[PDB]
Amino acid sequence: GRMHAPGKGLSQSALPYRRSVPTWLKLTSDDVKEQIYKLAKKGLTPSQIGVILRDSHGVAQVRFVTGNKILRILKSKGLAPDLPEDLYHLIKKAVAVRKHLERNRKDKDAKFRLILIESRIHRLARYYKTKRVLPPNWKYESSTASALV
Amino acid sequence: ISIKLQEEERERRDNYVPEVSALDQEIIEVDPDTKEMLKLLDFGSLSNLQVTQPTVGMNFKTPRG
Amino acid sequence: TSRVQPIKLARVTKVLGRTGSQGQCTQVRVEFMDDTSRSIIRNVKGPVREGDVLTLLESEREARRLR
Amino acid sequence: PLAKDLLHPSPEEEKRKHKKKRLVQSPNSYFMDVKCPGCYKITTVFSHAQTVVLCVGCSTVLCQPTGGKARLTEGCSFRRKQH
Amino acid sequence: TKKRRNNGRAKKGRGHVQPIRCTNCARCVPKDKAIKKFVIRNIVEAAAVRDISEASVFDAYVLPKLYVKLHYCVSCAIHSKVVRNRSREARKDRTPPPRFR
Amino acid sequence: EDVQGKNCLTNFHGMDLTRDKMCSMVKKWQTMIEAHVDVKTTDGYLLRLFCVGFTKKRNNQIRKTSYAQHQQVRQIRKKMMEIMTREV
RNA sequence: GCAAGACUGCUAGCCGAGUAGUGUUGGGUCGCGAAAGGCCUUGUGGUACUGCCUGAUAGGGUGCUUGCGAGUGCCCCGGGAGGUCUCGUAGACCGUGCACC
RNA sequence: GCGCAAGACGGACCAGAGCGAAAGCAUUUGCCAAGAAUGUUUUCAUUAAUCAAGAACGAAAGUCGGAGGUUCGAAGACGAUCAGAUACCGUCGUAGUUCCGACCAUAAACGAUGCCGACCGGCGAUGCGGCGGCGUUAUUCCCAUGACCCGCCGGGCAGCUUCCGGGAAACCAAAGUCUUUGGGUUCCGGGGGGAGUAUGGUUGCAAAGCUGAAACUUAAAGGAAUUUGGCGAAGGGCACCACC
């Protein structure tokens, strides 16, 4: 089932079998790349950018209207951050958990979920280090929150 | 017990027969759903077949628990 | 007590099972002629048939078990 | 039972069961076209609009996010479109 | 061996329940294991309600009731004949006996 | 609090209910709702209004449970808060 | 523009008029709902009921007759005849113990 | 009967209901933080339930320093009971039972059943979220909403039945897919005592936890289940050698 939860779960997206640009869509690839660039100038994470372009522009998904995906074209444009959004959200959650934690000393399950989430970011950081994303001299401890958020 | 004269006292009642056939009534109460069931199979709307007025706004399965 | 209450007399309808420590008194359903609708269950000692009538002193208490 | 024609099912069982255990993978969602009665243009929105949506020109709000589908503003016409 | 499907209680996904003291006894029996009695009774018994009725200032005055809940330990339940024992296949019966009196 | 001779003058001090009625109101397979506000009148009278609430099974309901969600209970309780704030 | 079908609100002649006033959870184009003053076919037939409150001859809550159950009945007014309504039966507890082997 | 003060606890509502890794969790309100499941034509693209070293949490009782000590209550005192009670019973009753922090890591911590994944019957209800579909209600007209009803989907606590199949049988939708043996992966048991004992190491203020023998003795110790048997166990039937 889950990785730190004992509950089985079946809730995920299922892409259709059809691989074609829809006929009712009258939008090419260069212009949709232009509003991806504009929403990148807005400065948001690629997941909510993708769901809002699908939501408010009626496109099925980007990967069939252009040749590649959005993280590829942001790292081609160079505006994409070096730190991935998964570790960004998870270390923001860790900062919030510790910021709740030091005021309330008698909080055991918050500490338990804290230990679970540095275990999670360590297991993700090993994969991004062996995939040549993070530098090999990068380290994490509980006292590094001002340098990376 | 077992009978060999086939119990004449109601055997003669079996020989007694109503003049009506007890199924060939002047009209037959037919719901629209079984009407459109029989309509697709072999026979459409007949003279003996009538449409039940919908009194089905209240449901079934009286409460038990 | 200390109340002058009149004597009401009653007529039997059905005989029922008999209670008691040794099993001597019989529960009987019985009813009045001056008010036919109201019927009462009373404890009676002795052999009772159907068709007779019974003399009763109190119409206030209710029959119960062996104690 | 034991004998079911798994190759060519009747349509009611793959509109009956869950999407992930169908014979072929097909989602249960779709794209929707909605317009305002006070406006003129027709925008294209998802079935699960997931956020607040506003048309260009700032005329009105089309629909609100809800954990199921989107709850549309009243009076707006809609047509089930397919590709 | 195992006697019942459950263990004389109703603990399925908890592992711990609040105990409540018995009435006749003083045992710290849990809520799901103990037998609970909710009796419906009037203020007085049945052979005096008429004697109350002619002794009342009011006319057609309704007699109030008492609504109490009794918590019974299993030893106090078997000692007071509240619940009896059954056979092997007779224990496969969840429904209560019919209330006739 | 006021006597002069062969008379005693009374005043409202509190309202209660019989134990038998409130014991008749509590039953299983229903949700009990409690709501109390400390309120003040136009004069210097400080009150405390206790109220109870018991759900109603529908006449065509087949469910024996007939419960309600927690936030529905919170909304009903807040409605009781604003009602007994308004009327006193 | 042409085609005839199917259903419904309201009224029992129509305007006034669904103006006022009332309330609801959220709204709407809105429910309830007469009158003053009037003008004219000068004002539709059959059909059963009806415990109490709320809110409609609906809905909701709640009774009486004999303990129970099934029938029967429970709007207002005026006359007559009656006076013990009919049918079948659990409606059971209700002072009671218990050392030491 | 009228008030004041202190401490403890949140009954009835309260279920073979919910949540949590487990211990465990119930007066209202506010603040902070986390999470399951549902939905997704959103993002990353193999990032994995598997785990000695190591680490967190952990019922009650036990220890240490502080104010509080209502009620209950180990040892102790008294009186009955008994042939004999420093036992069952009754009245007081210290430490504790209550809070903050510092400890220990033991339970029948038991579903007496490790974790993940797949497959193999049906039925009726429950909780969450979503979905479709007559009708009633927040009074009468129109829409979304809450309430109710009829169906579907996924997850969860659960129930009934059986020649699916298994087992020694109790019984099992897992305790099945096992000689017609092999999905992956930790811990752990070779008759019964001796004995979780001695020694050693280990941690602990203490109480003590973990690791953990040998000599010698025994042919039994044990698990399921059937029939009179015995209850200071329940229920029923009969008897003028029992009663009324």
Tab-separated table of N, CA and C in Angstrom, chain D residues 11 15 38 40 42 50 65 73 80:
chain	number	residue	atom	x	y	z
D	11	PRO	N	-21.625	-3.023	-23.003
D	11	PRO	CA	-21.129	-1.716	-22.520
D	11	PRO	C	-21.471	-1.383	-21.070
D	15	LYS	N	-19.235	0.651	-18.129
D	15	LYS	CA	-19.684	1.863	-17.445
D	15	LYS	C	-20.136	1.576	-16.017
D	38	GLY	N	-25.075	36.437	-19.629
D	38	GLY	CA	-24.773	37.845	-19.797
D	38	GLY	C	-23.605	38.141	-20.708
D	40	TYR	N	-20.937	36.433	-24.050
D	40	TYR	CA	-21.097	35.898	-25.395
D	40	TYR	C	-20.180	34.725	-25.695
D	42	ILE	N	-17.508	31.429	-25.442
D	42	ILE	CA	-17.580	30.080	-24.896
D	42	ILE	C	-16.176	29.653	-24.497
D	50	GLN	N	-11.289	22.095	-10.231
D	50	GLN	CA	-10.179	21.967	-9.279
D	50	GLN	C	-9.792	23.280	-8.582
D	65	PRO	N	-14.611	25.279	-7.137
D	65	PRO	CA	-14.031	23.952	-6.911
D	65	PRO	C	-14.780	23.185	-5.835
D	73	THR	N	-22.346	27.698	-12.212
D	73	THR	CA	-23.288	28.786	-11.990
D	73	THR	C	-24.589	28.488	-12.727
D	80	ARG	N	-22.495	18.208	-24.184
D	80	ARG	CA	-21.519	17.132	-24.007
D	80	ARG	C	-20.726	16.963	-25.297
